[PDB]
Design a protein around this ligand. Structure first.
Ligand SMILES: Nc1ncnc2c1ncn2[C@@H]1O[C@H](COP(=O)(O)OP(=O)(O)OP(=O)(O)O)[C@@H](O)[C@H]1O
Ligand SMILES: Nc1ncnc2c1ncn2[C@@H]1O[C@H](COP(=O)(O)OP(=O)(O)O)[C@@H](O)[C@H]1O
Ligand SMILES: [Mg+2]
Ligand SMILES: [Mg+2]
Lengths: 48, 375, 303, 70
């Protein structure tokens, strides 16, 4: 699990944050909608 | 007749245009077909030299490594102390590098387009030439101090009540150098990390040794300055470490030359006397409340671009002006137009100034009235 | 008609070259886009910070894995739009920068911004119409009639303060004007600029005033300023400092070096004697107004 | 009171190896760089010569109170 910094317009292109490590541009899965992926939220995130 | 020749060539030129334009569009993306293959060159530093091929480095990451180099890249030039570039895979030094500029300092250097001048300031010209004496005179003429036989001072500071022009003076100085005037807010230099608050004081002044005629300005030192403590909270430990790095970096084991430090504060009471030492801080410039002539001066400065009518007795404004700042006269000239903004008078009548002084005057009844004499 | 067949034959040869030309570049796009979507399907972007841009053209960055990297070749972003101190999305293995990521804004700063418009109207506020009037004209008119202040020509006023007994209505005007103007309203709590680690409240100041710098129609509110605005004191052996750090960047960052007229400050306290007079100067907080107790008629009006 | 100046004069007229460290630089960001930075200086004083270490602003390191929570 991680923490979301923010999204951007027109695209998913999420900005993620973790405990100590760096910050990534990440994406959804197909199992969830982009509705409740609101900013400042903890999400479970695969390792690869 | 060749009349049908030019009618034919019109499809030939635009025929080749479909080659040239889309071929250039394939060329601009053809640069990225191989241009996206560069691999990093881990930023390191040369510790010493063991043999001609046995070198020894340490990254900005962690541990110390033993490394080789390329046989064509001037191994004699690899001095202990330089910043070099590495290999990620086989760990060999690829290319010597210049010094770093640590972009907080690059974004400290030249981001002020403030073009205020000495014409704008008024009333403290003795302190203007007095402050000029350290930063402009020996920077242009060292030979008089060399013949007399005394070294010019290192740095000086500015103290007084708030709103006497202490920031405005340094901004008037800031419209002169444009490359080697480094201005410090004394709050960007601290973070929650271990020694990064000290790394900034290291490499700002390393950059000051890099650019020899240079001015360091220090605004509101009371956050970082301090007197000392008997070690109450856990936060002021490393801040005292950050300050004691600064004091040794001022005049410890170094020819402090051509790097002139100008400081400023509102209270020189919460300061270290070791920082207030005449070895380190050489002159203490006292900026006081304006006199009647200087309030007349600042009044005529801020009274310039005001649509008025010529009946302004500036004497009476100064006469009710007792114990005023350099900015509250700008508040009076601002607020006479705040009387002019009602009843739609585009001009300014002479009465709204005496109304304005009678509002600004009792507006500052809630002031604290401290003089803050340096000790 | 002699040479028109030869020149028409050459032009037909040129169109016959144009067919394989558009086919040539139209075939040239596939192999380059196949690796373009290869470096774009590496969508996990390990963002970094642009340390420095060389001239011997090159660049050095630092990923937020605390890792420094030299690079000879920049990538898809050119050098001209970049500067030392930026932050970009970088490839993982090649460490090759790809995009340009816009801002660095904290989630607490994002929590400060309203999106609700709490509706209040001035006839819900009876018997304060002088302070209401001088409050509205000092803020709203530098947002709607700028050429009126430039007509005579003055710098507009900057920084209002309200003080008095804590029941006279101080939040009420802020929620009133927050319903009135259609600008970027931004509120603050008193001890919100108080942090455990050092420098975090100060960076929280410069991030908020960076965001209010970004929104050019925007005004800033502070509730209960005395939580951070305590007057300083000289003490050995003890004494806080970290609150006075953020207070000093509130002073300098508010007013002084590199000022601007884009935001207006609305500060709310009830007690004044605690406050450091450095923020009480003339220009950091211009219009200091008190809210007295209602005389008789406003007491009838409130009920 | 000539605290730095006397070390300048002795360091000028000395004939042995002089090692001159600044006592607020042992606080590196990384772990271990500090302690290794402590031990290799005295190792170089050992291997080098009958040498002289100089340390200034000892208050940056040797304080009285401590806190095993930061
Ligand atoms: N006598 C004066 N005449 C004209 N302008 C003045 C006068 N006094 C002050 N001012 C103006 O008012 C502002 C306040 O003065 P000054 O800049 O010296 O305060 P400061 O030292 O920057 O405050 P702080 O350092 O506490 O933030 C200045 O920018 C200056 O231009
Ligand atoms: N016109 C008015 N005059 C005085 N008080 C009012 C008026 N309208 C509403 N109030 C009440 O007074 C309060 C105003 O809040 P305020 O006095 O700013 O709180 P505090 O200053 O203690 O933080 C509101 O909670 C509201 O119920
Ligand atoms: Mg309130
Ligand atoms: Mg000394």
């Amino acid at each position: 699990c991680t923490k979301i910094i923010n999204a951007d317009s027109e695209d998913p292109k999420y900005i993620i944050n973790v405990k100590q490590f760096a910050k990534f541009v990440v994406d959804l899965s197909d199992q969830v909608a982009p509705t409740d992926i609101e900013e400042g939220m903890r999400v479970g995130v695969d390792r690869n | 007749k060749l009349l049908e020749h030019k009618e034919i060539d019109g499809r030939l030129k635009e025929l080749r245009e479909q080659l040239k334009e889309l071929t250039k569009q394939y060329e601009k993306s053809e640069n990225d077909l191989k241009a996206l293959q560069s691999v990093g060159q881990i930023v390191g530093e040369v510790l010493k030299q063991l043999t001609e091929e046995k070198f020894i480095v340490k990254a900005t990451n962690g541990p110390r490594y033993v490394v080789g180099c390329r046989r064509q890249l001037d191994k004699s030039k690899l001095k202990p102390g330089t910043r070099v570039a590495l290999d990620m895979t086989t760990l060999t030094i690829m290319r010597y590098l210049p010094r770093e500029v640590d972009p907080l300092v690059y974004n400290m250097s030249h981001e002020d387009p403030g073009n205020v001048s000495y014409s704008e300031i008024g009333g403290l010209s003795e302190q203007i030439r007095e402050l000029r004496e350290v930063i402009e005179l020996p920077l242009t003429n060292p030979e008089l101090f060399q013949r007399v036989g005394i070294i010019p001072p290192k740095g000086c500071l500015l103290y007084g009540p708030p709103g006497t022009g202490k920031t405005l003076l340094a901004r008037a100085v800031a419209s002169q150098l444009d490359c080697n005037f480094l201005k410090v807010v004394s709050s960007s230099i601290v973070d929650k990390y271990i020694g990064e608050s000290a790394r900034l004081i290291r490499e700002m002044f390393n950059y000051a040794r890099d650019h020899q005629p240079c001015i360091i300005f220090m605004d509101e030192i009371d956050a970082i300055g301090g007197r000392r403590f008997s070690e109450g909270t856990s936060a002021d430990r490393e801040i005292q470490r950050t300050l004691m790095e600064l004091l040794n970096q001022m005049d410890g084991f170094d020819t402090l030359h051509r790097v002139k430090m100008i400081m400023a504060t509102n209270r020189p009471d919460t300061l270290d006397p070791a920082l207030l030492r005449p070895g380190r801080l050489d002159r203490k410039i006292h900026i006081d409340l304006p006199n009647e002539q200087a309030r007349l001066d600042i009044l005529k400065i801020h009274a310039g671009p005001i649509t008025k009518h010529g009946e302004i007795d500036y004497e009476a404004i100064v006469k009710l002006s007792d114990g005023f700042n350099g900015a509250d006269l700008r508040n009076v000239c601002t607020e006479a137009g705040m009387f002019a903004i009602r009843a739609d008078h585009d001009f300014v009548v002479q009465e709204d100034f005496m109304k304005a002084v009678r509002k600004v005057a009792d507006s500052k009844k809630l002031e604290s009235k401290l003089d803050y004499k340096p000790v | 008609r002699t040479r028109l067949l030869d020149s028409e034959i050459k032009i037909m040869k040129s169109e016959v070259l144009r067919v394989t030309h558009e086919l040539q570049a139209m075939k040239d796009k596939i192999k380059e886009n196949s690796e373009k979507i290869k470096v774009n399907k590496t969508l996990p972007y390990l963002v970094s910070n642009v340390i420095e841009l060389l001239d011997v053209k090159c660049a050095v960055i630092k990923t937020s894995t605390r890792q420094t990297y030299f690079l000879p070749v920049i990538g898809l972003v050119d050098a001209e739009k970049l500067k030392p101190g930026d932050l970009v999305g970088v490839n993982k293995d090649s460490y090759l920068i790809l995009e340009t990521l816009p801002t660095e804004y904290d989630s607490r700063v994002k929590a400060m911004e309203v999106d609700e418009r709490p509706t209040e109207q001035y006839s819900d506020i009876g018997g304060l119409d002088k302070q209401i009037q001088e409050l509205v004209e000092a803020i709203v008119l530098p947002m709607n009639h700028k050429e009126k202040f430039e007509n005579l020509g003055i710098q507009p006023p900057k920084g209002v303060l309200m003080y008095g007994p804590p029941g006279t209505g101080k939040t009420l005007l802020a929620r009133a004007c927050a319903a009135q103007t259609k600008a970027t309203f931004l509120k603050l709590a008193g001890p919100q600029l108080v942090q455990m680690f050092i420098g975090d409240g100060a960076k929280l100041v410069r991030d908020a005033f960076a965001l209010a710098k970004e929104k050019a129609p925007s005004i800033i509110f502070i509730d209960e300023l005395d939580a951070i605005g305590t007057k300083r004191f000289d003490s050995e052996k003890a004494g806080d400092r970290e609150v006075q750090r953020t207070m000093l960047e509130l002073l300098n960052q508010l007013d002084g070096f590199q000022p601007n007229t884009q935001v207006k400050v609305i500060a709310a306290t009830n007690r004044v004697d605690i406050l450091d007079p450095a923020l009480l100067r003339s220009g950091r907080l211009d219009r200091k107004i008190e809210f007295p107790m209602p005389n008789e008629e406003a007491r009838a009006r409130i009920m | 009171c000539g605290k730095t100046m006397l070390a300048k004069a002795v360091a000028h007229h000395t004939t042995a190896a002089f090692i001159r460290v600044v006592g607020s630089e042992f606080v590196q960001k990384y772990l271990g760089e500090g302690p290794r930075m402590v031990r290799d200086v005295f190792r170089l004083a050992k291997e080098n010569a009958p040498a002289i270490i100089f340390i200034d602003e000892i208050d940056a390191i040797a304080t009285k109170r401590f806190d095993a929570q930061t």
